[PDB]
A = this chain, B = another copy of it.
């Protein structure tokens, strides 16, 4: 249906907590082959994948220069959010008490 985006993402709005438990971040897609899927991995303190943690519906870069809203529910402890692929990828961090 869609494959995962090859290209670069930049941060459009800095990650912030919502009124509910949640975290939101906005990214802008700079690459090609859109529409395509935003690659998102959430990892724990060890290097491990955490599933089921993504609130936003199946998240997509519609176009080059489109903007995607990603809402997550980070797990307890330290977590890292990896957006995109390659050297270009953005690696984010969150702490939940």
Please give the number of chain A residues whose Cβ is less than 8 angstroms from any Cβ of chain B in the complex. Answer: 19
* Residues B1 and A85 in contact, CB atoms below 8 Å apart: no
A65 within 8 A of B: no
Q: Which of A11-19, A21-29, A69-77, A86-94 contacts B (4 or more CB under 8 A)?
A: A86-94
Name the residue on B nearest A3 (C-beta).
B89
In the bound complex, CA of A39 to CA of B27 (Å)? 21
CB contact list, A39-97 vs B, under 8 A: 39, 43, 47, 51, 82, 84-89
* Residues A85 and B4 in contact, CB atoms below 8 Å apart: yes
Between A and B, 7 residue pairs with Cβ closer than 8 Å are A3-B85, A4-B39, A5-B86, A6-B6, A6-B87, A39-B85, A51-B51
